[PDB]
Amino acid sequence: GPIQLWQFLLELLTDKSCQSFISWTGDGWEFKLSDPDEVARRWGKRKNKPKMNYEKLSRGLRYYYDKNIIHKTAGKRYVYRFVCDLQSLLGYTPEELHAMLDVK
DNA sequence: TAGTGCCGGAAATGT
DNA sequence: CACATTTCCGGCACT
To answer: Which residues bind DNA?
Structure first.
């Protein structure tokens, strides 16, 4: 079972106990790694990569640009946005998930 | 400045 | 394998 990066992020983004380092911005599917190092750290443990960091992690994200899985919110640091049909994948709309997560 | 975000090419890596 | 990162790096831009 090899989880992919974009799926790891979704996993973090739907667990309240993770809002400290990663969270939805309240605008659709846009999200922010408030503490990229902690995200990278956890991404590193899951994949067994002791030397993982936000630099390498984000190169992973950049490869999603053409795959249109995740796009970059230009100008906002550590801010990206899922551009794929997450409403169909998760079954929730951004509002519903935000409400359910207590996103502010 | 040099430090840091961010970008995308090139090659390595590993399940 | 196929390929999704992982790793490394020259570059551009901003503070």
So the answer is: 3-83
DSSP A41-98: HHHHHHTT-TT--HHHHHHHHHTTTTTTSEEE-TTSTTEEEE-S-HHHHHS--HHHHH
Residue among A11, A13, A19 nearest A46 (CA):
A11
Give the integer Cα–Cα distance in Å for A7 and A94.
17
CB A53 within 7 Å, strand B = no
Method: X-ray
3-state percent breakdown (helix, strand, coil) of chain A, nearest 5: 40, 15, 45
Q: Are A61 and A5 in contact (CB under 8 A)?
A: yes
CA A8 to centroid of chain Cα atoms: 7
Top-level CATH class of A1-104? mainly alpha
- In angstroms, the CA A102 to CA A19 distance is 10
**Separation of A57 CA and B2 C1' (Å):** 23
